[PDB]
Design an enzyme around this catalytic site. Structure first.
Site, PDB file in Angstrom:
ATOM      1  N   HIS A  60       0.857  -1.091  -0.099  1.00 36.10           N
ATOM      2  CA  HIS A  60       0.335   0.481   0.335  1.00 36.10           C
ATOM      3  C   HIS A  60       0.056   1.179  -0.516  1.00 36.10           C
ATOM      4  O   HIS A  60       0.457   2.459  -0.527  1.00 36.10           O
ATOM      5  CB  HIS A  60      -1.157  -0.505   1.191  1.00 36.10           C
ATOM      6  CG  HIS A  60      -2.108  -1.112   1.355  1.00 36.10           C
ATOM      7  ND1 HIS A  60      -1.371  -2.189   2.128  1.00 36.10           N
ATOM      8  CD2 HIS A  60      -2.890  -1.424   0.443  1.00 36.10           C
ATOM      9  CE1 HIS A  60      -1.989  -3.233   1.750  1.00 36.10           C
ATOM     10  NE2 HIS A  60      -3.219  -2.818   1.491  1.00 36.10           N
TER      11      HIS A  60
ATOM     12  N   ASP B 289       2.435   5.848  -6.341  1.00 35.01           N
ATOM     13  CA  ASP B 289       2.371   5.874  -7.361  1.00 35.01           C
ATOM     14  C   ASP B 289       0.843   6.708  -7.668  1.00 35.01           C
ATOM     15  O   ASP B 289      -0.299   7.051  -7.481  1.00 35.01           O
ATOM     16  CB  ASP B 289       1.890   4.104  -7.632  1.00 35.01           C
ATOM     17  CG  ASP B 289       1.682   4.041  -9.148  1.00 35.01           C
ATOM     18  OD1 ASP B 289       2.196   5.291 -10.354  1.00 35.01           O
ATOM     19  OD2 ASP B 289       1.302   2.699  -9.935  1.00 35.01           O
TER      20      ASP B 289
ATOM     21  N   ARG C 235      -1.089   6.538 -11.107  1.00 37.59           N
ATOM     22  CA  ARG C 235      -2.432   5.945 -10.639  1.00 37.59           C
ATOM     23  C   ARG C 235      -3.544   6.429  -9.532  1.00 37.59           C
ATOM     24  O   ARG C 235      -4.366   6.300 -10.133  1.00 37.59           O
ATOM     25  CB  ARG C 235      -1.833   4.582 -10.395  1.00 37.59           C
ATOM     26  CG  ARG C 235      -2.699   3.627  -9.737  1.00 37.59           C
ATOM     27  CD  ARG C 235      -2.649   2.878  -8.933  1.00 37.59           C
ATOM     28  NE  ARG C 235      -2.906   3.469  -7.831  1.00 37.59           N
ATOM     29  CZ  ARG C 235      -3.345   2.903  -6.800  1.00 37.59           C
ATOM     30  NH1 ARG C 235      -4.812   1.847  -6.698  1.00 37.59           N
ATOM     31  NH2 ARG C 235      -4.076   3.761  -5.107  1.00 37.59           N
TER      32      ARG C 235
ATOM     33  N   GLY D   4     -10.988  -4.757  -2.553  1.00 41.31           N
ATOM     34  CA  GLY D   4      -9.863  -4.606  -2.250  1.00 41.31           C
ATOM     35  C   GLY D   4      -9.214  -3.287  -1.502  1.00 41.31           C
ATOM     36  O   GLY D   4      -9.031  -1.947  -2.949  1.00 41.31           O
TER      37      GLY D   4
ATOM     38  N   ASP E 220     -12.087  -6.045   1.558  1.00 42.16           N
ATOM     39  CA  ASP E 220     -10.320  -6.293   1.439  1.00 42.16           C
ATOM     40  C   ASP E 220     -10.422  -7.550   2.975  1.00 42.16           C
ATOM     41  O   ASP E 220     -11.105  -7.337   3.719  1.00 42.16           O
ATOM     42  CB  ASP E 220      -9.741  -5.060   2.134  1.00 42.16           C
ATOM     43  CG  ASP E 220      -8.299  -5.570   1.249  1.00 42.16           C
ATOM     44  OD1 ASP E 220      -7.487  -6.131   1.574  1.00 42.16           O
ATOM     45  OD2 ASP E 220      -7.701  -4.242   0.393  1.00 42.16           O
TER      46      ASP E 220
ATOM     47  N   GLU F 161     -15.153 -13.321  -2.409  1.00 46.46           N
ATOM     48  CA  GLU F 161     -15.636 -13.854  -3.358  1.00 46.46           C
ATOM     49  C   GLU F 161     -16.500 -15.175  -1.822  1.00 46.46           C
ATOM     50  O   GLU F 161     -16.876 -16.468  -1.777  1.00 46.46           O
ATOM     51  CB  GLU F 161     -14.927 -15.245  -3.703  1.00 46.46           C
ATOM     52  CG  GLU F 161     -14.676 -14.565  -5.195  1.00 46.46           C
ATOM     53  CD  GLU F 161     -13.355 -13.816  -5.172  1.00 46.46           C
ATOM     54  OE1 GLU F 161     -13.103 -14.075  -4.104  1.00 46.46           O
ATOM     55  OE2 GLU F 161     -13.411 -13.463  -6.490  1.00 46.46           O
TER      56      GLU F 161
ATOM     57  N   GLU G 235      -8.612  -1.536  -8.091  1.00 46.47           N
ATOM     58  CA  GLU G 235      -7.041  -1.079  -7.945  1.00 46.47           C
ATOM     59  C   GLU G 235      -7.672  -2.691  -8.309  1.00 46.47           C
ATOM     60  O   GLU G 235      -7.374  -3.151  -7.219  1.00 46.47           O
ATOM     61  CB  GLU G 235      -6.358  -0.429  -7.222  1.00 46.47           C
ATOM     62  CG  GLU G 235      -5.426  -1.331  -7.511  1.00 46.47           C
ATOM     63  CD  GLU G 235      -4.771  -0.328  -8.382  1.00 46.47           C
ATOM     64  OE1 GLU G 235      -4.258   0.982  -9.332  1.00 46.47           O
ATOM     65  OE2 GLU G 235      -4.282  -1.735  -9.526  1.00 46.47           O
TER      66      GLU G 235
ATOM     67  N   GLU H  41      -1.851 -12.158 -12.017  1.00 51.02           N
ATOM     68  CA  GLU H  41      -2.045 -11.538 -10.833  1.00 51.02           C
ATOM     69  C   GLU H  41      -3.225 -11.276 -10.106  1.00 51.02           C
ATOM     70  O   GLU H  41      -2.604 -10.022  -9.383  1.00 51.02           O
ATOM     71  CB  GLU H  41      -0.453 -12.283  -9.950  1.00 51.02           C
ATOM     72  CG  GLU H  41      -0.069 -12.970  -9.727  1.00 51.02           C
ATOM     73  CD  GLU H  41       0.620 -13.333  -8.700  1.00 51.02           C
ATOM     74  OE1 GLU H  41       0.635 -14.537  -7.984  1.00 51.02           O
ATOM     75  OE2 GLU H  41       1.354 -12.489  -8.291  1.00 51.02           O
TER      76      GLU H  41
ATOM     77  N   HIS I 227       4.140   2.398 -10.950  1.00 54.97           N
ATOM     78  CA  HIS I 227       4.638   0.729 -10.153  1.00 54.97           C
ATOM     79  C   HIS I 227       4.579  -0.066 -11.413  1.00 54.97           C
ATOM     80  O   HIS I 227       5.188  -1.702 -10.620  1.00 54.97           O
ATOM     81  CB  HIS I 227       3.866   0.693  -8.797  1.00 54.97           C
ATOM     82  CG  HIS I 227       2.899  -0.319  -8.862  1.00 54.97           C
ATOM     83  ND1 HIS I 227       1.351   0.540  -9.264  1.00 54.97           N
ATOM     84  CD2 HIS I 227       3.142  -1.509  -8.018  1.00 54.97           C
ATOM     85  CE1 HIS I 227       0.826  -0.652  -9.287  1.00 54.97           C
ATOM     86  NE2 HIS I 227       1.320  -2.314  -8.649  1.00 54.97           N
TER      87      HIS I 227
HETATM   88  N1  LIG Z   1     -10.012 -11.614  -2.853  1.00 58.56           N
HETATM   89  C1  LIG Z   1     -10.000 -10.498  -2.347  1.00 58.56           C
HETATM   90  N2  LIG Z   1     -10.896  -9.910  -1.658  1.00 58.56           N
HETATM   91  C2  LIG Z   1     -10.403  -8.984  -1.018  1.00 58.56           C
HETATM   92  N3  LIG Z   1      -9.824  -8.301  -0.628  1.00 58.56           N
HETATM   93  C3  LIG Z   1      -8.506  -8.695  -1.982  1.00 58.56           C
HETATM   94  C4  LIG Z   1      -8.967 -10.066  -3.029  1.00 58.56           C
HETATM   95  N4  LIG Z   1      -8.045 -10.003  -3.409  1.00 58.56           N
HETATM   96  C5  LIG Z   1      -6.978  -8.877  -3.486  1.00 58.56           C
HETATM   97  N5  LIG Z   1      -8.192  -7.935  -2.426  1.00 58.56           N
HETATM   98  C6  LIG Z   1      -6.895  -6.931  -1.498  1.00 58.56           C
HETATM   99  O1  LIG Z   1      -7.053  -5.802  -2.826  1.00 58.56           O
HETATM  100  C7  LIG Z   1      -6.273  -5.063  -2.600  1.00 58.56           C
HETATM  101  C8  LIG Z   1      -5.618  -4.670  -3.664  1.00 58.56           C
HETATM  102  S1  LIG Z   1      -4.532  -3.224  -3.826  1.00 58.56           S
HETATM  103  C9  LIG Z   1      -5.699  -1.374  -3.529  1.00 58.56           C
HETATM  104  C10 LIG Z   1      -5.591  -0.721  -2.604  1.00 58.56           C
HETATM  105  C11 LIG Z   1      -6.538   0.516  -2.043  1.00 58.56           C
HETATM  106  N6  LIG Z   1      -7.333   0.190  -3.219  1.00 58.56           N
HETATM  107  C12 LIG Z   1      -5.991   1.701  -3.791  1.00 58.56           C
HETATM  108  O2  LIG Z   1      -5.511   1.529  -4.789  1.00 58.56           O
HETATM  109  O3  LIG Z   1      -5.072   2.547  -3.092  1.00 58.56           O
HETATM  110  C13 LIG Z   1      -5.130  -5.794  -1.905  1.00 58.56           C
HETATM  111  O4  LIG Z   1      -5.525  -4.731   0.002  1.00 58.56           O
HETATM  112  C14 LIG Z   1      -5.804  -6.810  -0.820  1.00 58.56           C
HETATM  113  O5  LIG Z   1      -5.812  -7.388   0.318  1.00 58.56           O
END
Ligand SMILES: Nc1ncnc2c1ncn2[C@@H]1O[C@H](CSCC[C@H](N)C(=O)O)[C@@H](O)[C@H]1O
Ligand SMILES: Nc1ncnc2c1ncn2[C@@H]1O[C@H](CSCC[C@H](N)C(=O)O)[C@@H](O)[C@H]1O
Lengths: 313, 314
Positions: free
Chosen positions: B4, B10, B13, B37, B59, B88, B106, B115, B257
């Site tokens: 984070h 970034d 972004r 997320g 999250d 999910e 994001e 990923e 990034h």
């Molecule tokens: N299946 C899932 N369910 C819930 N959260 C998830 C997830 N897969 C990824 N994440 C969360 O998604 C985040 C993406 S990072 C983006 C963080 C924020 N939206 C920003 O832009 O600053 C991570 O913190 C991860 O914990």
């Protein structure tokens, strides 16, 4: 990905290379064991130096590519590789029970974080014949104070205003994380204190459960100091006919280890000849044992005790 | 937590998201917002500041705890509600809410898709997004071109021929299969740019991502050897803003990034101006690790013999 970084670490790899191949008479007909052989580069160094029998141990599947590397360079008859954790090895192969030399690339960040030190000493107490050699065998740690105002505003003070919002709730955990990065020689504003020395020839594992030590250095400028920087030196002391060493400090060219930078919650306004004296204590984290707790308590000119705690996670 | 800090520093972004939201306060005001997320909640804070009536952040990591405090600290606890868990695995959105008006996420990975959270965003769209709702962002396009990159190919690939006097060529095979995620200078680009993929999160079905089959074409503009291809993705906040917002991850703008993805050619192409490199790319989930990315290429130079190369992003 690790082994490219390792092998591209010229200062590191050349130190091991020089200490092995520049004492071929020492290595010839010795039995050598290599803890964490990886690609087998050091096994290749020992075999090229004249070892009759070399054993490599490594837990990842890099053991496979190494067999091929060794077969390609014509030492499969000399170098024998085992896949596994050292702590899972029943017996070394072929009924060997003692070795003449132990090779290990064991130093972690800040020397001790995610290091294999506790593994090397286990292989030392199990297999090293009396008077055997360890490449390397002696480490000393240093620390000093730096002016680093540009980076402290950026990694620490940054959370006070993140896109107009107040994220100070993170500020604590930012100060608790020591920074692994390069420090320029120009930034040092004090003398350097040697605060730790490990002699793998004699150090006992129990003496690592909690390390207690101290440090002392003197400021040379009227200046605010925002962090301390630590680094370690390495010596292949016993074995070579002239000692071999490399540093991980900011006065020489860099290694992959960089330096470790410890941010002070409050900048110390130092004046020349100020004496900063303090205690460092280092132990494995109580909850997640692969984490490194590091606590500091220090004073400036015998004044009030400033104390800060760090976790390498 | 290291993620984070990287995400928030970034600038290109974060400002695109900042602009796409706060530049449409009338669009966002009184909406119900969902943040897939949410992390530290920065985008929730953007949404709340934008005028949203209710914002929900989901999250799976424990960073949600620090986000709770950050939201309380910026005086939005009454607007922003945070839930810990995998999207999910969430039985229902809180408060008896069953639909949302806007989804912010994001989700983009390296090479856009490696990923990536894309298939998670899509269940949240199919579970909760009202008909005609908005996705921030909603449309990504990928680009590709050829570069001159001989110094780095000698250094990252040819290095294995002799490392401290020994022969390590056994490493060479897997070195070429691994695409390099790194920055390339625009100066090195020696061809036109080929747009070879487009995803529209409004309409795409998740199944249509298990195997992506597409093609590309670009033209050399110089007499030059070409040692690698470089790909990148762009992002558009298409539906919602009244003037579109976008950011790029290519080498002609400031770095982000994600950097770029570099695909090293096993055999360098001696190109001439106006040579046409045309091919098929296919991107699919790896059979052994399903979070690994198989990437296959078959191409020609001036319709000549078919060169083919395979990569795994692990
Ligand atoms: N299946 C899932 N369910 C819930 N959260 C998830 C997830 N897969 C990824 N994440 C969360 O998604 C985040 C993406 S990072 C983006 C963080 C924020 N939206 C920003 O832009 O600053 C991570 O913190 C991860 O914990
Ligand atoms: N407990 C353990 N038992 C066996 N191998 C270990 C181990 N802990 C770490 N390793 C291995 O030690 C290696 C350290 S990297 C150093 C590799 C090699 N000596 C070189 O200089 O190039 C890693 O490949 C890791 O797989």
């Amino acid at each position: 990905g690790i082994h490219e970084e390792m092998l591209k670490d010229g200062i590191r790899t050349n130190a091991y290379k020089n200490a092995i191949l520049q004492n071929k008479h020492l290595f010839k007909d010795k039995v050598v064991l290599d803890i964490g052989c990886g690609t087998g580069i050091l096994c290749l160094f020992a075999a090229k130096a004249g070892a009759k029998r070399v054993i490599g141990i490594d837990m990842s599947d890099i053991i496979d590519k190494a067999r091929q590397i060794v077969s390609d360079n014509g030492y499969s008859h000399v170098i024998e590789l085992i896949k596994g954790k050292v702590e899972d090895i029943a017996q070394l192969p072929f009924g060997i029970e003692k070795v003449d030399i132990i090779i290990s690339e064991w130093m972690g960040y800040f020397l001790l974080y995610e290091s294999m030190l506790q593994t090397v000493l286990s292989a030392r107490d199990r297999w090293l014949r009396p008077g055997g050699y360890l490449f390397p065998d002696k480490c000393t740690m240093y620390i000093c104070g730096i002016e680093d105002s540009e980076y402290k505003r950026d990694k620490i003070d940054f959370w006070d205003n993140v896109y107009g919002f107040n994220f100070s709730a993170i500020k604590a955990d930012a100060l608790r994380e020591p920074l692994v990065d390069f420090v320029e020689s120009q930034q040092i504003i004090t003398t350097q204190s040697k605060f730790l020395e490990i002699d793998l020839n004699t150090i006992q594992p129990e003496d690592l459960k909690q390390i207690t030590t101290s440090f002392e250095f003197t400021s040379q400028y009227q200046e605010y100091c925002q962090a301390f920087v630590a680094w370690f030196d390495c010596v292949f002391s016993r074995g070579p006919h002239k000692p071999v060493e490399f540093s991980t400090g900011p006065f020489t060219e860099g290694t992959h280890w960089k330096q470790t930078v410890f941010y002070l919650e409050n900048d110390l306004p130092l004046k020349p000849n100020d004496v900063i004296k303090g205690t460092i204590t280092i132990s494995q984290n109580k909850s997640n044992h692969r984490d490194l707790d590091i606590s500091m308590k220090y004073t400036v000119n015998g004044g009030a005790v400033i104390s800060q705690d760090y976790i390498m996670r």
